[PDB]
């Protein structure tokens, strides 16, 4: 139901509104408010995941709304192609940034309601365009500012829309 038109192709996402209600609603809102238009996948790590939704070209961090509670304990594993919320070490700090697993990453799953075990909340999955994710994951990257794994050439989310 969500379409991410990027300069590498279009990624279509299906959200799990019931299994991760607060997270799905938070994401959909950002899309609706056009917050993701013009953002990049600033952290691309082959064999791990691709993260975006927080920076504009030149690593310019956008403002966000208040954090959301962590819904990682919903029984959903960080399987290949699932989308989940990136965050601060603080479990309940997720805001606008998300990542798409490019590999089964069980280690990211909730194990306990503890600082280190809270895990990362899966709230959807790439329904169409997994090939787009497969290509993005292997693009050239390098360090910039206090960021590593930044794509040499910007991977841009031109527009995100609810369909």
């Amino acid at each position: 139901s969500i379409k991410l038109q990027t300069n590498h192709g279009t990624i279509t996402l299906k959200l799990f509104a019931d299994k991760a209600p607060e997270t799905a609603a938070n994401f959909e809102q950002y899309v609706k408010d056009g917050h993701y238009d013009g953002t990049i996948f600033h952290r691309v790590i082959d064999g791990f995941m691709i993260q975006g939704g927080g920076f504009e070209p030149g690593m310019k961090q956008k403002s966000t709304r208040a954090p959301i509670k962590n819904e990682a304990n919903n029984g959903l594993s960080n399987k290949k192609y699932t989308i989940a919320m990136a965050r601060t070490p603080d479990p309940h700090s997720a805001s606008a940034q998300f990542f798409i697993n490019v590999k089964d990453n069980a280690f990211l799953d909730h194990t306990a309601p503890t600082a280190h075990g809270w895990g990362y909340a899966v709230f959807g999955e790439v329904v169409e365009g997994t090939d787009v994710v497969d290509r993005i994951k292997s693009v050239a990257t390098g360090s910039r500012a206090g960021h590593g794994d930044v794509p040499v050439d910007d991977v841009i989310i031109e527009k995100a829309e609810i369909v």
């Binding site: 995941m49 990136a86 965050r87 601060t88 070490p89 990542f99 990453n105 990211l108 990362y120």
Partner: peptide
Amino acid sequence: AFPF
């Protein structure tokens, strides 16, 4: 910066 997470997940690490």
